[PDB]
């Protein structure tokens, strides 16, 4: 579809997967990454703060090296879209850059094209194929994911295609977005990266009762928390009028010892299942 902001718009809201994490004002609803309304202008300020030549160069760096600068309030979750699974082509990345420039600025085709030699080509990815050290299948991993007899059951907290229970983020489609390495880290180091909005809050009530958990819903009268203990969850409804203090914490309620609770085979099977969620 060429290199234009119009082509980039289709890619941002399509095969680039950008809109699975980013919204643009009232367009879209994803909150995993920052709202990109006004991105063109704040890229200019990012560039000045980071010593880059231009806002456009900051946009390029944000795609090719997402870890290099981490926007305040977020964790290192953005994938390299030129790598698997997304495998976004170089022309499509150039198009996306034109679209990003149109978010409060002017697309500059000549300037974008000069960064072509900095964009890795998806077909030339250096990522090695993912080969588990045992024969496992996605179907085997699906069974593990929903197995209530294990000491951890992913389906107690994660929904996939309408099955499971909504505590953490729905995992439908995540295999089209994230890497196996991200799945490994998410399972074995769950608080290393916290999906935005799924932070644990520490609550103290006026009667001095502590409640530590994930906010399920936040209304004018009531705060509903999900508390976790040893892989089990429970809800508490706390009247807003009784809340003395609330502090967000950079920790996840996803159990921190899953490496002790899954076998090698169950672990690699569940990763194959996640990879398969396209």
Which amino acids are annotated as binding site, given as ranges? 18, 21-22, 32, 42, 46, 58, 66, 69, 71, 78, 154, 157-158, 182, 190, 193, 195, 221, 228, 234, 241, 252, 254
- Interface positions, 62-81, toward Ca ion (CB under 5 A): 62, 66, 69
CA distance 261 to 22: 34
**Candidate residues 13, 69, 202, 211; the one interacting with ligand HEC per rule CB under 6 A:** 69
Q: Which two tokens stand for residue 4?
A: 């234009």
Partner in contact with 174, chosen from Ca ion, ligand HEC, none, beta carbon below 5 to 8 Å by kind: ligand HEC
Residues 118-157, interacting with ligand HEC (CB under 6 A): 152, 154, 156-157
Both tokens assigned to 248: 């967000």
CA distance 271 to 7: 33
Q: Minimum Å distance from CB 54 to ligand HEC? A: 13
The least CB distance from residue 262 to ligand HEC, in Å, is 6
Axis crossing angle, helix 39-50 with helix 55-64, rounded to the nearest 10? 90
**Residue 143, φ and ψ in degrees, nearest 5:** -60, -40
Q: How many residues bind ligand HEC (CB under 6 A)?
A: 55
Write the CA distances from 202 to 72, 115, 166, 184, 267, integer angstroms.
Answer: 21, 45, 20, 27, 31
Distance CA 222, CA 272 (A): 39
Stretch that binds ligand HEC, among 69-77, 104-112, 203-211, 216-224 (CB under 6 A): 69-77
- Tell me whether residue 9 or residue 228 sits nearer to ligand HEC (CB atom): 228
Coil, strand or helix at 259:
helix
Instruction: Name the residue nearer to ligand HEC (CB basis): 107 or 252.
Output: 252
Residue 83 · residue 177 · CB < 8 Å: no
- Residues 248-277 touching Ca ion, rule: CB under 5 A, are 252
Residues with Cβ < 8 Å from 58, sequence gap 6 or more? 43, 44, 46, 47, 50, 52, 69
Select from 85, 107, 175, 190 the one that contacts ligand HEC (CB under 6 A).
Answer: 190
Q: How many CA atoms lie within 13 A of 173 on its CB side?
A: 9
User: Could you list the residues that contact ligand HEC (CB under 6 A)?
Assistant: 16-18, 20-22, 32-34, 39, 42, 46, 59, 62-63, 66, 69-71, 74, 77-79, 81, 96, 100, 152, 154, 156-158, 167-169, 174, 177, 183, 186-187, 190, 193-195, 198, 214, 228, 231, 233, 252-255, 258, 270, 274
């Amino acid at each position: 579809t060429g290199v234009s902001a119009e082509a980039g718009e289709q890619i941002f809201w399509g095969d680039g997967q950008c809109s699975t994490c980013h919204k643009i004002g009232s367009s879209g609803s994803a909150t995993r990454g920052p709202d990109q309304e006004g991105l063109a202008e704040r890229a200019e300020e990012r560039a000045k703060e980071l010593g880059l030549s231009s806002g456009l160069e900051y946009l390029v760096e944000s795609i090719i090296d997402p870890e290099k600068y981490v926007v305040e309030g977020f964790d290192k979750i953005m994938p390299r879209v030129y790598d698997p699974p997304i495998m976004l082509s170089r022309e499509k990345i150039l198009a996306v850059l034109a679209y990003l420039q149109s978010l409060g600025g002017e697309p500059d085709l000549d300037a974008i094209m000069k960064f072509k030699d900095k964009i890795p080509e998806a077909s030339k990815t250096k990522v090695k194929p993912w080969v588990p050290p045992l024969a496992v299948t996605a179907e085997e991993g699906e069974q593990v994911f929903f197995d209530e007899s294990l000491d951890v059951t992913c389906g107690k907290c994660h929904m996939v295609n309408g099955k499971g229970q909504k505590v953490g983020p729905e995992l439908t489609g995540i295999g089209a977005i994230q890497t196996p390495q991200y799945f490994v880290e998410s399972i074995l180091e769950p608080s290393a990266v916290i999906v935005k909005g799924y932070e644990t809050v520490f609550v103290i009530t006026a009667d001095g009762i502590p409640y530590n958990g994930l906010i399920k819903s936040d209304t004018e009268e009531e705060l509903t928390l999900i508390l976790e203990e040893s892989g089990s969850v429970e809800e508490v409804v706390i009247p807003k009028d009784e809340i003395e203090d609330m502090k967000k914490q950079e920790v996840s309620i996803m159990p921190g010892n899953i490496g002790e609770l899954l076998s090698v085979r169950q672990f690699y099977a569940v990763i194959e299942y996640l990879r398969s969620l396209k």
